[PDB]
Design a protein around this ligand. Structure first.
Ligand SMILES: Cc1cn([C@H]2C[C@H](OP(=O)(O)O)[C@@H](COP(=O)(O)O)O2)c(=O)[nH]c1=O
Ligand SMILES: [Ca+2]
Length: 129
């Protein structure tokens, strides 16, 4: 896999946001995770966590997996990095997302994320409290 450039257009919620990729606006959905919706417990906290991490970054990058790059809603499916730190992993490590939607052929970072989830669960963080 490889990282490609993008810039923030607007935060949306814990696992989606609007980025400019190859000069076009796209909604991206984070691979392999599921944050609560804004109206749900920890939803505001997931939204705030992703918003801060992406808005404070000097450099945003997107990394597509080996499979599908857009979902049935036209959202890009990627691992998003903020100054080299993976947003998907950081949400899971903080107990603000669960590992979820693991489809075969777009699952390169599954084990990295399950290790973060085990750590968040051991710590009883947030969703795991
Ligand atoms: C994360 C992800 C979601 N999706 C689809 C599955 C779910 O379909 P349904 O909308 O039919 O439930 C939806 C979950 O996204 P949200 O968690 O953003 O709602 O997005 C993919 O198809 N591929 C993916 O990698
Ligand atoms: Ca969600």
């Amino acid at each position: 896999l490889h990282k490609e450039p993008a810039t923030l257009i607007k935060a949306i919620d814990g696992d989606t946001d609007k980025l400019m990729y190859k000069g076009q606006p796209m909604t991206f959905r984070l691979l392999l995770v599921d944050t609560p919706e804004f109206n749900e417990k920890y939803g505001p906290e997931a939204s705030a966590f992703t918003k801060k991490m992406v808005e404070n970054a000097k450099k945003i990058e997107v990394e597509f997996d080996k499979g599908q790059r857009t979902d049935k809603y036209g959202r890009g499916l990627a691992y998003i990095y903020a100054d080299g730190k993976m947003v998907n992993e950081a949400l899971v490590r903080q107990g603000l997302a669960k590992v979820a939607y693991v489809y075969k052929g777009n699952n390169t970072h599954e084990q990295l994320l399950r290790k973060a989830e085990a750590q968040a669960k051991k710590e009883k963080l947030n969703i795991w409290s």
